[PDB]
């Protein structure tokens, strides 16, 4: 099938975005950094390890559902084009394409991410594996370029992994209204949401006894040190995984053991860390079944399917425009 990549990000947009996030994020109280910056090369290898950890259930909880329900997703959505808000490198991607292909209605795959190299490998993969499929990879980000996604016949947008949990309720509702707006009648959105559960089970999923999440979390300091000429005594920052009972969300913090002071060279900046001061690096909001349909209805979408794994740990929503 025909391949195409459209690149809406300038050659520097990545490093430019990094430069302002840590510049602004290190001057907040408390200091905070978006979780997008975890995922350099060693960060992605660390995450793929995380998905294989016994304690990290969401990855396998969502694959359990998708293995069982993919033909339903297809027959409900009846979509000829699968739009992935992600890299397209997972096996869940394949299960969704297989379902659409089995239905007989698969024409077009649209991977949508901010890394053209990943989009290209993905585009080659899907081209070698699915003759007949047009791959129209789009390289952009959500706030500006969701409008650049092609139209096709009838579109299944897919945002899995409970990645939507990284948006607190403000940006979450804003992200969904805008995604609802680029959607048109007949299109649907397939949404993965990790569910509220035993707080011990939640914290343990982000502080594995093996420490793989710990080095994954402090890898954002390794990224800032490398890409921006900084001097984080990375080991002096302790991994902290918190359950926030009032907000119902996991939080990953890096706690500074003793007073620290750090200079970020590319930004001519120096920031201080009090002894025991924490810096927020990721939020995973945990969800409730009807509250997810509610949020989808407030974005202008209407849920028509809900599914969980055998234990009720993870949920997948299907929502029509
Ligand atoms: C989904 C996605 C969409 N668009 C751009 C992306 C750019 C880089 C990485 C991903 S991502 O796929 O690597 N992503 C990241 C956030 C944490 N996530 C959690 O689940 C936390 N509990 C989910 C999952 C690991 C992107």
TrEMBL record:
Cite the SUPFAM superfamilies for this sequence. S-adenosyl-L-methionine-dependent methyltransferases
Q: Which UniProt keywords apply?
A: Methyltransferase, S-adenosyl-L-methionine, Transferase
E.C. numbers: 2.1.1.44
Enumerate the spans annotated as Histidine-specific methyltransferase SAM-dependent domain.
19-320
Reactions mediated catalytically: L-histidine + 3 S-adenosyl-L-methionine = hercynine + 3 S-adenosyl-L-homocysteine + 3 H(+)
Domain of life where this protein originates: Bacteria
Task: Provide the top EC class.
Answer: transferase
Q: Which GO terms describe its biological process?
A: ergothioneine biosynthetic process; methylation
Name the family: Belongs to the methyltransferase superfamily. EgtD family.
User: What is the recorded function of this protein according to its Swiss-Prot or TrEMBL entry?
Assistant: Catalyzes the SAM-dependent triple methylation of the alpha-amino group of histidine to form hercynine, a step in the biosynthesis pathway of ergothioneine.
Tell me the subunit arrangement: Monomer.
Q: What is this protein called?
A: Histidine N-alpha-methyltransferase
Per the UniProt entry, what species is this protein from, by scientific name? Mycobacterium tuberculosis
Q: What is the lineage of its organism?
A: Bacteria, Bacillati, Actinomycetota, Actinomycetes, Mycobacteriales
Tell me the gene name. Answer: egtD
